[PDB]
Amino acid sequence: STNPPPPETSNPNKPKRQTNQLQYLLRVVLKTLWKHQFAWPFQQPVDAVKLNLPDYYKIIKTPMDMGTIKKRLENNYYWNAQECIQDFNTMFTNCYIYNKPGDDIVLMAEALEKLFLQKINELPT
Numbered sequence: 001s002t003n004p005p006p007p008e009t010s011n012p013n014k015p016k017r018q019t020n021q022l023q024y025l026l027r028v029v030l031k032t033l034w035k036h037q038f039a040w041p042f043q044q045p046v047d048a049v050k051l052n053l054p055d056y057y058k059i060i061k062t063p064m065d066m067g068t069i070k071k072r073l074e075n076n077y078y079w080n081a082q083e084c085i086q087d088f089n090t091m092f093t094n095c096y097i098y099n100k101p102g103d104d105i106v107l108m109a110e111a112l113e114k115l116f117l118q119k120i121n122e123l124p125t
């Protein structure tokens with residue numbers, strides 16, 4: 001089954017913004033999570049062809065991944081931290097929707113989500 005086009009990482013109709021919190025989400029939150037041993041499945045859009053998940057995009061209609069989020073942050077695509085946080089949460093939720101409790105990929109998402117929540121608990125002012 002085909003992959004859809006990946007989510008946009010720029011949008012000229014959308015206003016950009018740089019905030020201390022968005023800087024921090026890239027420099028600290030994203031870039032540290034990225035180095036985690038369980039980060040690799042989330043560093044690019046789900047390749048449903050390669051992974052032999054032909055029903056992935058029949059189920060997941062708002063795909064998200066850290067590769068896309070990283071590019072969005074580097075673009076200053078977001079208006080605020082909450083928009084970016086929402087993308088992280090979409091990424092985790094997608095994983096829990098498509099997969100089942102106890103699955104290896106779910107254990108990976110669960111661990112990353114905990115680390116993510118740990119790091120966004122306190123943001124710059």
Ligand SMILES: Cc1noc(N)c1-c1ccccc1
Pocket residue numbers: 041042046051053095098099105
């Ligand atoms: C990401 C993701 N979301 O659902 C999966 N099965 C995966 C995945 C699982 C194993 C390797 C790579 C990706």
